């Protein structure tokens, strides 16, 4: 009987907090902006049937409307999932992305859509953070192997040279100094050191901004 | 009963002031125009429901029409949000963006449209500065860590040369000069300086230009 | 009752005087023809509601038809702005940009359209000049700072070397020669000099050529 | 009579576990996302007639409805293969891929679809690992041949130099040192070590993600 | 009443005479065929209202039909402008550009169209030279500045090495040679010579070619 | 009467065995995956009239339906060929390649489609091995000529050097060693070595995988 | 009454004779096959109204049909021009270029079409030869100027070096040796020579081949 | 009456014999596969009227049907040219090219279709051989001129080094030895030999493959 509508877009750099420069850090090591990628997760969370189901189940609004009939309670749940409607923008006609939520009173429509948007955002950020951890750890592992191969090339160059000099200053000298490492090696080594520190995983960042924040509707549907 | 019309297009370099040259500065480090991206935020602010809500709330126009009934004051707020109509252009057709505003008199429709355009532009600039602020800060920490790693590499190379000389002037010469630094270190350091100064926040800047300025309507709607 | 028509296209190189080589100068420092860009602004001026309004207000033709009533006078002005009709070309079809002006006599239709085309073109020129002035200024600021960072880089290196020669002739050599400047720095210094002269802003230049010049129509509309 | 629904999309990077780093490691040697290619396999598995057939064969649900007549049991299996329906998504219109499974009860339709999705996904992972195992193997054979050839090139140069210099320190050294090897050879050598260790096959991995997870339907079909 | 037809297409290399080598020369400095650009100007001239108007004014066919009454003559001139009809081609359907000219006799229709075509081509060839002359001058100025700057760099390095020596034969020595100029300065220098001489403006050249030459119609329209 | 159906897709890397790493080896020498290419030939074989005809002639099913009349037996053969129908997949609609086979009993439809799919696969495998054997022959001939050209160049340079020296250590020196061969020569020598071994031509490999395996139809057509 | 058809295609390399290697030589100096380019001129000639006109005027067949009435003779000429019909290929659906010719008897239709095709081909060759001759001149001139700038650079370097030395052997060296020319200069000098010889212009080459040669029709149109 | 059908596609590398390696040899100098280009020509030969006409004239089938009258035998030939129908494929729908041949008996339709396809293939191969010859020949001329020039460059250098030497050991060195020659020269020379040897001509090769071999029709059209 009453609805709120939100219209959203990509979050700003500031909103992404610690997430932004670590995802850029990783990118400028691997080779659609971070804020787009982040938004894409949000938009997926917002439209997801699962996201809508999990939201309602953790709501007082829903819980208070149960009657203890397994089957009427499942249908109520299904109705409520169908009362959150996401419409993908098409940007050919300046139509932005929007979500609408239907409920039985006006303050409920406003409060619940704001809460849903936050819920969708928190799930998105948790997820983008999962992906960051398993991109950081993977790049750490990859970098460890490269540095390890570099040690093993160096040592094999050292051993060849070691052999060749035996067959008296240069033997002892080379034997006390070890394998000869280039700048490439020393650079990768320092990069490992920051990588080994591990990412900062802050769960609080926002994953969208509002072009239209929900408000108490003034008339019924 | 009376409506004003405006027609906008993207700003120019001068319209953008200190923001332009700060934005290009940061693009020349991470390696569509700056004014296209300015205008895109402007158009977004212009169409925005939030922008319209907040414009009216700050208006003597809306305030003098308040009766102190909260429900009715909210309904009037909504009716006036719907009195500002944004119309996207289409470049296949060569139609520019245009915004309309309805009010109770001709002079009001004109002045209110001029204020609302200026209000939207100012919101766009603030947002653009916010982005800049936050991207500059990201880049600054990025550069800060790159120089640090640069210092650790030099220190590793130095220790190695320090052990290799132990195993007598060259020792004392090295023991006193510290680690050697490449041109790239000094250039980054000088780049860190200017970054540390931080950007010039100009809140002055226009984010659109008029092709058609609001004037007084000649007849009612 | 009577109308003229103009058909336009982009200005020739000669028609831009000094504006051309200067815009070229600035183009070939950062890495659609200059004449295309110029014509772009002209076309935008020619179609603008503001340009038509300002044109008529400045015309004796309009002034002689005023009756001293504010409303009647604003209606007449609005009617006149609508009497200048720009039709964008379809260059798939060899249809070019064209402009029609309706008036009450044949000589008026012709003289006015001529004056209108020149009025629009003058506004385009002034604006292309504000852009130029603001593009040169930005470039000069970026150049100064680059050179300044270059001097700070040479200074850090000098001090480092200085401090390294200490721990005797070559100390005095270094002490009297100052920092070492690369060719790149010297090129930047001379480029800077020409930039500090600052652009010549000739307001004259023309911003379109005629494919069809207005003439006195031989019959009524 | 009862039906469950699921909607899927491509898995994420950490959903792929060990598979992703290994496949990325291979692509880096021989110089469309890994998740895209994983999802493509998943989708092929989910739609596959063979996969449906083999899923019902291993199901207690099917097995408890067999009567031990080979014709009647083959007819039932057929009815049940046709009771899993894959419905291809459509990029043009933001429709995602989806699958429906029909069964004799509501709990069955839920459990079974969950089991089918997991079953199709384990088959996709088995397949991807198989591809990895085989591609990695060819890579390894290739690499061996390359190293072999580099050693035949170095031996040829050795003999030529050996023979040349005869016609005595340099002779005897040459005799002691063996062929000379460049950096690329030790680099390949070190790489060959890691290919020999063989890829670690993560058999646990997920090849899709849920947008909509099966639930017990509320009413009959 | 009596009409004639021409069909044209782009001119060939030899067709452009001495204009072609000149345009290629300038193009090989800053870094659609020259013949494409030329045809485009021809087609533009052929179709232009101004071109048709000026053609008829300069015609004996028109002058002999003037009655010495300004209005009656301008009406006749207008009817003649409309008696020349450009029909743009479409290169989707292998249709070439054609042009029709209607006149009071078959001989006239033939001669006039031939004259009109030659007139349009000559106006195009003047416009092309003009562009050349101006693009060329702009390039010389640019080139003058470039060399000028090269000398300021050369002098700065001179004065710095002069100062470095002061603080002996090598002094006086450097004092006699002057600044050291690289290969590139002398190259620019010799190019500047060929730029100063100025382009050759062949006024001779053709800007189109006939696929169908005008002939006397056999009958009336 | 009864029909079976198969749906197929590109073979895995594994099913290509020794063929894959050999097609790859040839691919890196000259400068769509190998498995796509393999599948392409399979699909060609599956749909070919010749392949269907050759298949049935080689079948007891056909031989047992012969009556010893040339006309009746040719007509029967033609009816069989028309009983194997191939439908190219439309990948945009997630519909894959499928082949259907009609026959007189359900077990016959199943077993013959299996044999037929295997028949076509084996024709594809032998064909791909003929392309291999001959691509290799082509590469091997070219390599030999390149090497021979290299020998004849070093010979020319040798003789040039030989005359010049005569006209005395280095004379007998040059005489005793021979023409000077660079590393690129030696790399080509080894590459030729491995080319002379010649490819392995395993006819055994598989050239499709099933997404739908033929099964006994449960009902007539 | 009767008609022949020919179908053509681009000429072979061989049919182009001496023209081919010369156009290739000018191609490899200016940094769409030659035979394609030649055929493009052929097809232009073949379709051309002027070509059909000039052909008929030069034919006994037309000359013999003249009656000495201008009007009747011109109408007959026009009628015969329209009896040569060219239809452009559509290469998407394997329809090649063709030309049809109508005449009053079957032998005439064959003979005249073979003549017309030969006539069109000869005009094509003559034109391509003019194109060539003018390209080879444009090129000779450019090389002449290039070599002359080179001469003047070397002289400037010589003069500068000559002076510096004055403030005794190597002076008299410089005196007698002259300016120092690079390999580039000498290569360009030798190219200049082959250019001065001038192209060969055999006007005999064929500019099409036939896929369908005209023949005597076996029935009336 | 009766007809046969053949379906064809592009040949495979082995089917091109000695032609492939030769065409690729020329191709790797000059800076669609060879089998595509081979196939392009077969298809043209197959569909060609000339090819169909000449095929029939050389057939016992046609000869035995001639009656010794020119008009009657020409009408027969024509009927038979129209009895070979080529049908291009459309690969959007996976349709291959196919050719049908009609005749008075079944055995004739089969044998004639087989002979016609081979006839067309033979013509294609001859044409491709001719192209290869011409292209080879031209390229030899080219290289002959390129070596000629290379010698003239070295000769000019020799003369200059000679003259500078004049104003005595090295004078006799240079006076005895000869002009100096770069690697490029000897490599070109070695290439010139293999070019002089000339191309090997397979008059043998196959220029298509069968997807459907003509067979005896079982029934009429």
Curated annotation (Swiss-Prot), chains A, B, C, D, E, F, G, H:
GO terms for cellular component: plasma membrane. GO terms for molecular function: identical protein binding; protein tyrosine kinase activity. Residues 1-221 are periplasmic. It comes from the Bacteria. One of its GO terms (biological process) is enterobacterial common antigen biosynthetic process. It is a multi-pass membrane protein. Modulates the polysaccharide chain length of enterobacterial common antigen (ECA). This is ECA polysaccharide chain length modulation protein. It comes from Escherichia coli O157:H7. The lineage of its organism: Bacteria, Pseudomonadati, Pseudomonadota, Gammaproteobacteria, Enterobacterales. The chain holds residues 54 to 318 of 348 of the full protein.
